[PDB]
Each structure stands twice: as structure tokens, then as C-alpha cells.
Design a protein that fits this description.
Tetracycline Repressor, domain 2, mainly alpha, magnesium (chain A), DNA-binding transcription factor activity (chain A), 9 helices, homodimer, 70% helix, 176 residues, RNA-binding, Homeodomain-like_sf (chain A), antibiotic resistance (chain A), Arc Repressor Mutant, subunit A
RNA sequence: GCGGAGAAUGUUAUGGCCUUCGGGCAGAGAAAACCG
């Protein structure tokens, strides 16, 4: 009856219906037509479920985490953020559920590959980490306030122009 | 005895001791030695308290929201973010409590003055607004990731305060703002 | 004392509850309550 694919897939849908704060493991159990002591074998508590949702939104939509070979470091940073953005825009309050999740080991591994690639293109290791953190921080902050300001009742162009302010600022600083 | 100056100071202290998630109007009443029906007369619920706490953290520490006499538009944006950052670092989870608070009428009015300042300095109004949202978003995002990841390549993690990423990152937008406006 | 029990209702506390009337209790893996 219940597999890993089924329970989070409905959890992804109920996250849209209710929101992160209103979300409860009990409403999920009732959504699946099951008792809670049974569902505990899949999700131990609410917090673990949020981790599973965060991992699953990144796996599905953050598809440009790696540079398509034959791509500039600029275009990589661009589309990495655009894919990272679209992943947090995939579901309601997507930035919050992604927020507060300890990262996995492959995410570290992907960071070394991200770090190595920029060093290959002339970056210093110091500036490589600063650069990667800056684009990520601005993308995360942009998505958070976007989804939060969307709780009150365009912002996409503000993200684009802001991202290019980082990139073409990265360009000039690399001139060394 | 109880004035809403004291309740904000103690709520800020309870905000530091307990955190945004644990912070509740009930614990604040216990901290002040009063019943909840008494405290309701000052702050109705948690959400009103969050706005009250957020506003005064900016009032205390966001002291460089205005361009200093005889200062570059560049240095303004740097010191604008640095003050906004220090305001969000003033208390525990300061970025989270600041998040989700819709702004005052004075803040809009302050932003229009900010917009005019950079527009007057050669910015287009469209690009003027983009710059301020970007620096704010990155500063907000930078502080959130910082505050979240403190309740916890080989050379890389070794070289990690979090301020240098903010400082170096902010200069990446301004040095990008400079080139982009030279057009 | 602790077993049914990761019990139920409920969320973000102007209220809901215990009290030996001094006071005490708790938030999505609640305070309570019942039942050996």
C-alpha cells in the first residue's frame, strides 16, 4: 500500500494545501487513509518529513547544479541559481522547508566539484567559496521574502537583474 | 510598573534566551511576573510581538539607513547593508523575526528618499529599485543562512568567520553596480 | 510508581487545564482526562 514514493508525493501536495506551519503529520496520515502508528515507519516526525521534502524538491527541479560541459563559469552560476530558485518555487513555502535542513554528503561532494570547476577557470579558492556563497545567499533570500510577501494577500525581474549584478561584478574582480 | 518599553526589552531578552520558535506571549508574561490577561493589553499575540520586536531592532542598530553628508552612493549601499546586517544580528534569529513583517509608512517614505538619492546619482528608477532589493535580499539571505547554521574543501571549511563572505559578497554587487551603471 | 500509549482533542495561548487554594501545568511525537 504505502511506499516512499506515495507518501511524500501526497505530502508535497498537502504542503501546497496547508503551508509549512499548518502542516501536521496527522493530516498527512488522514490524507493517506492510514493510522498514525503505521505511518511512523516512514516518517518519524514532522521535522524528518520536512527534510525529506527538501531533499525531494532539490532532486526533482535543481537539475542545473553541474555545468554543461562547454559552458562558461558565468552561465553556470546563472543557471545554477535559476534551477536552485525554481526548486524552491516548486511548492508553497519551498524556501522555508529547504531552510533549516542539514545538507547531505553528496551536496558536499557537489560543492567540491563546484569549487574545483571555478578554480579551473581562474578563480582563487578563497574567491570561489565567496562567489558560490554570495549567489546562493542572494537566491535564498530572494525566494524567502518572495514566498513570505506572497503570504500577505514583478519579483522575478528583480532576481534576474540582481543576479547579473553579482556575475558582472564577479567578472571585473576576476580581472587579475 | 509595566510599560511597553519594558515588555519589548524583556521580549527581546526572552527572544535571545528561547528563540523565535519557542518565544511565546505566555513566557513573556511569566518573565514579567504578570498574568496573560494583563499582558494582552500591551501585545495581543505572538505576531504583533514579532513586529514590535523587529521594528526596534532596526531602530536601535540600523543607524546608517541614510547617506552621510559627503559620501559616495557606493559607500552608502555598503554601510546600508552593514547596518541592516548588524540590525539582524542584534538578537538571536534576528533575520527570522525581521522576515514576514510588512513595513511601516515611515519605511516606505524612507525608501522613496533612498530611491531619489540613487536616481539623482545617475540611476534609472528601474535599476535603482533592483539595486536596493538585491542588496537587501542578499543581506537578508546571508544573515538567515548564518543564523540557521550556528546551532550546529578540506582547506575550505577550515577558513570559516561568516562576515568575510558577506563583506566580499556585497562588494561583488557594488562592483557590479558600478560597471553596469557605466553605460 | 508506570503499563495500554508515540492515546485522544488542541496548536502559537486576552484562553484550555491541575490545585494540597499557597500556587502549579503544558504546544504537532501537548497539558488534561479515563482504564489496570
Amino acid at each position: 500500500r504505502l511506499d516512499k514514493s506515495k507518501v511524500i508525493n501526497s505530502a508535497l501536495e498537502l504542503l501546497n494545501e496547508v503551508g509549512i506551519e499548518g502542516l501536521t503529520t496527522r493530516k498527512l496520515a488522514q490524507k493517506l487513509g492510514v493510522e498514525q502508528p503505521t505511518l511512523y515507519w516512514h516518517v518519524k516526525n514532522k521535522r524528518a518529513l520536512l527534510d525529506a521534502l527538501a531533499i525531494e524538491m532539490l532532486d526533482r527541479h535543481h537539475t542545473h547544479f553541474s555545468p554543461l560541459e562547454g559552458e562558461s563559469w558565468q552561465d553556470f552560476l546563472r543557471n545554477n541559481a535559476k534551477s536552485f530558485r525554481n526548486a524552491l518555487l516548486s511548492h508553497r513555502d519551498g524556501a522555508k522547508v529547504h531552510l533549516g535542513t542539514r545538507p547531505t554528503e553528496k551536496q558536499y561532494e557537489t560543492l567540491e566539484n563546484q569549487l574545483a570547476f571555478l578554480t579551473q577557470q581562474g578563480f582563487s579558492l578563497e574567491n570561489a567559496l565567496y562567489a558560490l556563497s554570495a549567489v546562493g545567499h542572494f537566491t535564498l533570500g530572494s525566494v524567502l521574502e518572495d514566498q513570505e510577501h506572497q503570504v500577505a494577500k514583478g519579483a522575478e525581474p528583480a532576481f534576474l537583474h540582481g543576479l547579473e549584478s553579482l556575475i558582472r561584478g564577479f567578472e571585473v574582480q576576476l580581472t587579475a
